[PDB]
């Protein structure tokens, strides 16, 4: 059974405080091997890496922004909060052949190129099939691994597989091992991901997000919002 990754449900904190956020694994410490990462999601599902590899700071992101282990558990400290670091983080463990999110932390601030490009939106009807796609612009696609996870309404981010453009490679969740089928297509340098026989239970936002070995979910799609419906 895969581990559960757990975080603070809710933190809150205000202008100029310093405040730390904290991603526990069930099967024990959580250590270096597991890469821990961190994610913030700001209204508009806009979803940026911060911080992978434990402590490597994604470039461009505030310095105020920082990863250890401590406790046992990955950590995010906040060092100066401001007003528009009100969002949810998400933290992320690697288990040797998958990642699992955490349930992410809801932080209340009280008082306040690189494209991975997807279509807005599918609306199918149950028993359907979908193809959903994602475009790499700005980078060097067969260069990073392309991710795909699903976000539903009060289950968080759940992480389904990736691929390794170069080969074709996939790994998966163990919920969507016989479930999804990911596949790219080189010379437009675009990811695929393929459902059958979609229920409501399918019904989510998926989003794509590039990743290095050691480095980060820097890059994030706008995610298709999905909708299996009669
Ligand atoms: O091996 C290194 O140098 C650093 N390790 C990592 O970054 C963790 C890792 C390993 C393999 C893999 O397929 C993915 N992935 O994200 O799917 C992540």
């Known amino acids: 059974s895969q581990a559960v990754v757990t975080q603070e449900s809710a933190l809150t904190t205000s202008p100029g405080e310093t405040v730390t956020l904290t991603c526990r694994s069930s099967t024990g410490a959580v250590t270096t091997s597991n890469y821990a990462n961190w994610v913030q999601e700001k209204p508009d599902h806009l979803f940026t890496g911060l911080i992978g590899?434990?402590?490597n700071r994604a470039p461009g992101v505030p310095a105020r922004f920082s990863g250890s282990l401590i406790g046992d558990k990955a950590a995010l400290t906040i060092t100066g909060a401001q007003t528009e670091d009100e969002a949810i983080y998400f933290c992320?463990?690697?288990?040797?052949?998958?990642?699992?999110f955490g349930g992410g932390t809801k932080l209340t601030v009280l008082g306040g190129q690189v494209q991975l490009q997807q279509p807005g939106a599918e609306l199918v009807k149950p028993g359907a099939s979908v193809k959903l796609s994602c475009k790499a612009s700005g980078y060097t696609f067969t260069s990073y691994l392309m991710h795909w996870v699903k976000q539903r309404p009060g289950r968080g981010l759940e992480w389904i597989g990736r691929?390794?453009?170069?080969?074709?490679?996939?790994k998966y969740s163990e919920k969507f091992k016989s479930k999804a089928t990911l596949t790219v297509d080189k010379p437009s340098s675009t990811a695929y991901m393929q459902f059958s026989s979609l229920t409501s239970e399918d019904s989510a936002v998926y989003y794509c997000?590039?990743?290095?070995?050691?480095?980060?979910?820097?890059?994030w799609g706008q995610g298709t919002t999905l909708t299996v419906s009669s």
């Open positions: 590899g434990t402590n």
């Open positions: 992320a463990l690697w288990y040797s052949n998958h990642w699992v």
């Open positions: 691929i390794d453009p170069n080969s074709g490679g996939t």
């Open positions: 997000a590039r990743y290095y070995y050691g480095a980060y979910f820097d890059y």
